[PDB]
Curated annotation (Swiss-Prot), chain B:
It comes from Bacillus cereus (strain VD045). Changing residue 518 to A: Loss of endonuclease activity. ATP binds at residues 32-36. Endonuclease activity inhibited by all NTPs, dNTPs, NDPs (at 0.5 mM, UDP not tested) and AMP-PNP; not inhibited by any tested NMP, dNMP or nucleoside. Inhibited by 100 mM NaCl, 100 mM KCl, 0.5 mM Co(2+) and 0.5 mM Ni(2+). Transmembrane segments: none annotated. The gene is gajA. Optimum pH is 9.0. InterPro entries: AAA_GajA/Old/RecF-like, Bact_Antivir_Def_Nuclease, P-loop_NTPase, TOPRIM_OLD. This is Endonuclease GajA. The N-terminal ATPase-like domain seems to have lost ATPase activity, but may still bind nucleotides. The C-terminal Toprim (topoisomerase/primase) domain probably has the endonuclease activity, but when expressed alone (residues 348-578) has not activity, showing it requires the N-terminal ATPase-like domain for function.
Length: 268, 555, 474
């Protein structure tokens, strides 16, 4: 526990709970004076003109007559859109996820600089938009915020920016078996990296992948499989447009993961 | 305005009960007998938050959905010239009263199960005539009982936080309301609002407000901002005593236009004994709690009871509720605290033996220790009455369905200013119990040279002649569980174990030696009693009140 | 075998608290002072599921967080080869103990705040001596103390079934462990006959060997014997006082009435001890007309009835409850001998300080008349006894014991003199009030107006009422 800090992000985050549980780290430091102690003395002085005269015209002072500091505990973070001044307590689950991700990133970058931070993220595509999944994919696979993570997902849009990544596929042939593959895009594919990532990220979630060479093959084969076996993609089939040149990268990525690759091609 | 009656038909454990009420009602009984389900019958009738969910299948009697649930409440409205609450009721139900001098009102609840959708619908109806009830008008989620009745349900299981979260907007209700009486404070309550504005410029908050926004704007550079606010305020027994003053303060401020009904369920949970005495004084002496229904297991909440209505739920053959209007008279008011401290533990029993003093308590507690030591577990109780107040205890225990047994003595009391005359005391008490009048005084010719010991045997022979003269009244006392002694307790004890009383005290007259000091020599007798002496006391025919107290059919 | 002592050195409410303990002990007191932090000190020591979460900042005294939390439990293992629980302790402890001290055991808890990860870690040690305590060995999440103690916590009829299910699992599954029960407030939502049944089951049966019981009701102490009473005081500095409550073999026929009188007087602050019910009638009338909230502030009136005052004063003095005694001087005739009298009220006062009983006096009375003049001859003899023994009477005034010169009725005649002549209409109102005590006192207080109660209350013969109210002149 002196070396490893593990941050686990479930799909059912609650912003209130996380903030409350972590509020022991933030807002609980002495820090000397912070050059504003007379402002804190004006906090103390204006509380000395409210506790002796709370009676209005002697209606609640007389109600109390007949029977005779550290207030950071209930602080609530809100999200304010610009141009509006109101504070609605009801907020949707898209920004409430990403504020919890920002609070975990702030607590990793401030409180746990002495340790090794490991993220365990279960399904981060839930209640997010497509462009937020692409922005989270770029921040996961490019920046140095998440140095060590273990990611589980169901969405191809989080694999649009993947590089230098171990891909693990859990499947069943006779028992539960996991096949792994180390993923790198080469220097010769560095100009066409985004198109291969957008093609391959949907074909990673299949069982049998047919690698075709253009869109006319997709038109003819989608007509033939529309008329013969119309539930072919329910059962794990996929048609992958290569682009004519890229047969090594797709076949080694799909063959190391246990996915059956089928190639139909011409003699050029 | 006064509560008068309730009638519950087909409600869970209740089949048909008809219980008279008052403004102040105290509910008591055994465990799992229907004290919670009696309080929910007023929640389903008068509170909208329980009524808006409807009835399930389990709210019917013996899970039988063919029969119908009906809950009818009776109000007396004869104090229209003096009460403001009667004018609060009449201004809503204007058209449905049936005459210009009708002082009765009926608020009814009907229900009938639907088997296809599996739902119990609650239909509310009111009228001055029970045959001609009409439906309560309303629009949407609000009917017309909600403008007149406010029900405050007090349970000690809830904390101050769930009421305090409603109090966060009730502070805003205070600042807006009361015809701007806090408008003198409202410009400088904004000074207290801006005390919460320069808590936002410490640098531990101002660093968070910048760094969370700078961490958030690395995703898509969205047009957002992150702000922080707290909005707190300052003021398991002191939280509860704070919440009692919070409920009384909210009833004084908000609900001046509404009739407030308190449903206080088990208020002795995590309170001290002196706090129970203080809560009893607040509930029965102060005029803050005008109407309440209260369930309790503790006798210290009934130490100050007066002008109240005691409801006792019991089970002889069915779940049946007895009901008694408790008042203390003006002649009894000098000893009222001793009456309530004696009677409030005897209310929670099944068979109560009314004895005179502590010597009877010493002898009967050692005899009931030797014979039937679990008599307190089954519902037996020994009540010290002082020999003076027999009507009050017998009326209170007899109206609640508790079996009262009286064991007493045949005493003669000397008068004031006249020599030689005497008053029958025990015969007058036991004949004022049956409703008959008091008897005339009797004079005994005792000369001045006969004093000391022999005056007591002449008075004992006159007590024997008086007990022989009124034999049919003594048989009427034995018909009504009243046990009048011929002379005293000590002569019956000499009839029971008098060989052992001659053995222990060593004198030839052990009756006189124990009556020389009735509280010192009783312990000296009963420390030396064996097991066979206590069974000879218990199986004697002069001590059949103990056999009536234990409840067995041995005698 | 037996718990001897607990020492809470630093916790939430406690600054330095040292309580003597026993098996079968009951803790009571005022609201909002302690006594569930007493039960949390035992859950943090012996229950694993409370211990596994550590200590927060709010578990330290006044949020000071630079001190060390230390909770030490002392166990007495003096009885060997008689109880199985001592062998259950010694077969797990191994040899941390020493053969020089083969009688005492210390199980200690220490905690220091980390103040970087913001976590108070709980380190448990055990040993035979208080210095040189070694650590309890553990392999994973399992300690060596978890094989010894099983802790069953009860917090609320379905609750009697919840008692019986836990009792059935304790008598079926837990024969090899020491079972410690912590019962916190069992009287809530429970009828009082079931409270007396639970008190009989708690204090008579042998299925509850070790319990710590927290309560607010007097009906759970109706059957108490061989217990230890811990009272937490009402002050802001937490003081706990403990008493080993035992009932003697001589008080066996009195014990039900004794426990039913004392168990309501345990929940007070000032207890006035009186003899009979006519004292309760007169004092409740005078306290109704003068100081009507005395039960709210901690006063109590206790009836004794002639059991020599020792049991109540020892139990109330060991717990820190102030005891005031009001009594009368009476002579008791002897058994089988003529003309001799025991000085019973003076001996009953003299056994409280701790003395010998005085020698009995005798007076010669002829055959004459015995209706009236025998009482004034005995009253003159009582006046000569009260004039003789003035230094012991001033020693009783050094305590809170108030002995009357003759009776309560002569002090009441000395307080109000014209009012008892106006009400009773007699040449002597003392002798008419002495005829029927339970009837004529009711007739006196029915006709007693206001400011006669102030003349009773402000008198020098009734300073026990001013002690029971607690108003201080200087
Ligand atoms: N009473 C109101 N007045 C004005 N704006 C409001 C009010 N209540 C909610 N809003 C705004 O409406 C939005 C509520 O988000 P909502 O859950 O409706 O969106 P969504 O598109 O379903 O989100 P998500 O993608 O996270 O599921 C927020 O911008 C909130 O500020
Ligand atoms: N639908 C029903 N049909 C028949 N009996 C029912 C039904 N619903 C509840 N009961 C009975 O009513 C009981 C409810 O007890 P309740 O809580 O009303 O008693 P109580 O006097 O408040 O108890 P306690 O003193 O333990 O709080 C159940 O135990 C059951 O015997
Ligand atoms: N760390 C702490 N430092 C100082 N005081 C504390 C601390 N923790 C708790 N307290 C005080 O101790 C109190 C705890 O009360 P507690 O629950 O122990 O009382 P109680 O006698 O069991 O109550 P009741 O009779 O109402 O059930 C708090 O209200 C607070 O005043
Ligand atoms: Mg209940
Ligand atoms: Mg408590």
């Amino acid at each position: 526990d002196n070396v490893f800090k593990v941050i686990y992000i479930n799909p059912l985050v609650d912003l209130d709970k996380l903030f409350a549980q972590n509020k022991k780290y933030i807002f609980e430091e002495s820090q000397g004076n912070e050059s504003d102690e007379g402002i804190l003395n004006n906090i103390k002085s204006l509380t000395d003109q409210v506790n002796q005269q709370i009676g209005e015209m002697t209606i609640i002072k007389g109600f109390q007559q007949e029977i005779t500091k550290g207030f950071f505990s209930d602080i609530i973070p809100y999200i304010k859109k610009d141009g509006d001044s109101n504070y609605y307590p009801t907020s949707g689950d898209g920004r409430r996820k990403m504020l919890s991700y920002s609070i975990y990133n702030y607590l990793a970058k401030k409180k746990y600089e002495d340790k090794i931070v490991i993220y365990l993220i279960e399904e981060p595509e839930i209640s997010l938009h497509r462009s937020m999944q692409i922005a989270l994919s770029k921040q996961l696979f490019e920046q140095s915020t998440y140095k060590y993570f273990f990611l589980s997902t169901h969405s191809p849009e989080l694999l649009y920016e993947m590089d230098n990544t171990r891909l693990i596929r859990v499947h069943s042939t006779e028992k539960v078996v996991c096949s792994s593959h180390m993923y790198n895009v080469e220097e010769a594919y560095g100009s066409v990296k985004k198109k291969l990532n957008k093609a391959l990220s949907s074909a990673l979630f299949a069982e049998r992948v047919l690698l075709i060479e253009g869109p006319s093959e997709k038109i003819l084969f989608e007509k033939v499989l529309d008329e013969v076996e119309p539930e072919y993609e329910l059962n794990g089939g996929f048609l992958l447009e290569v682009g004519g040149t890229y047969f090594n990268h797709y076949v080694c990525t799909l063959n190391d993961l246990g996915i059956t690759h089928i190639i139909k091609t011409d003699n050029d | 305005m006064k509560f008068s009656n309730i009638t519950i038909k087909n409600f869970r454990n209740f089949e048909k009960v008809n219980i008279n009420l008052d403004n102040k009602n105290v509910i008591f009984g055994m465990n799992d007998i229907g004290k919670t389900n009696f309080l929910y019958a007023l929640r389903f009738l008068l509170d909208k938050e329980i009524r808006k969910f409807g009835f399930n299948k389990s709210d019917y009697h013996k899970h039988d959905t063919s029969k119908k649930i009906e809950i009818i409440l009776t109000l007396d409205l004869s104090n229209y010239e003096k009460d403001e609450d009667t004018k609060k009721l009449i201004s809503v139900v204007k058209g449905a009263r049936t005459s210009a001098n009708a002082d009765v009102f009926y608020i009814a609840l009907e229900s009938k199960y639907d088997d296809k959708e599996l739902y119990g619908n609650i239909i509310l109806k009111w009228g001055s005539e029970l045959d001609n009830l009409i439906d309560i008008p309303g629009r949407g989620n609000i009917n017309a009982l909600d403008n007149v009745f406010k029900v405050i349900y007090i349970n000690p299981l809830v904390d101050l936080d769930k009421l305090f979260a409603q109090n966060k907007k009730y502070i805003f209700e205070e600042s807006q309301g009361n015809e701007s009486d806090e408008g003198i404070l409202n410009n400088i309550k904004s000074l207290t609002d801006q005390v919460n504005q320069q808590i936002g410029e410490m640098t531990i908050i101002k660093g968070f407000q910048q760094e969370i926004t700078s961490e958030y704007r690395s995703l898509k550079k969205e047009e957002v901002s992150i702000e922080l606010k707290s909005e707190m305020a300052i003021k398991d027994g002191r939280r509860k005593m704070l919440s009692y003053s919070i409920y009384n303060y909210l009833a004084k401020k908000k609900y001046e236009d509404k009739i407030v009904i308190y449903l206080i369920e088990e208020p002795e949970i995590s309170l001290h004994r002196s706090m129970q005495i203080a809560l009893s004084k607040q509930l029965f002496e102060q005029s803050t709690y005008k109407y309440f229904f209260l369930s309790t297991h503790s006798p210290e909440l009934l130490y100050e009871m007066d002008n109240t209505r005691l409801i006792r739920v019991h089970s002889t053959e069915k779940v049946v509720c007895s009901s008694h209007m408790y008042n203390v008279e003006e002649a009894y008011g000098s000893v009222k605290k001793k009456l309530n401290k004696a009677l409030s533990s005897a209310l929670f029993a099944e068979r109560v033996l009314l004895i005179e003093g502590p010597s009877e308590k010493i002898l009967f507690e050692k005899v009931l220790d030797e014979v039937e030591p679990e008599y307190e577990l089954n519902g037996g109780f020994l009540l010290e009455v002082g020999g003076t107040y027999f009507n009050h205890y017998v009326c209170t225990l007899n109206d609640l369905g508790i079996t009262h047994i009286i064991k007493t003595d045949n005493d003669l009391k000397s008068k004031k200013g006249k020599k030689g005359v005497y008053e029958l005391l025990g015969l007058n008490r036991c004949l004022n119990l049956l409703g008959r009048e008091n008897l005339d005084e009797i004079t005994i010719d005792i000369p001045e040279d006969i004093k000391g010991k022999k005056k007591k045997e002449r008075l004992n022979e006159r007590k024997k002649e008086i007990f022989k003269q009124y034999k049919n009244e003594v048989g009427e006392f034995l018909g009504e569980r009243i046990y009048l002694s011929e002379i005293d307790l000590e002569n019956d004890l000499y009839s029971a174990i008098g060989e052992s009383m001659k053995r222990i005290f060593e004198n030839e007259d052990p009756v006189h030696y124990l009556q020389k000091s009735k509280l010192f020599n009783m312990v000296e007798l009963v420390n030396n009693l064996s097991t066979k002496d206590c069974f000879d006391v218990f199986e004697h025919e002069k001590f059949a009140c103990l056999k009536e107290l234990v409840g067995s059919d041995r005698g």
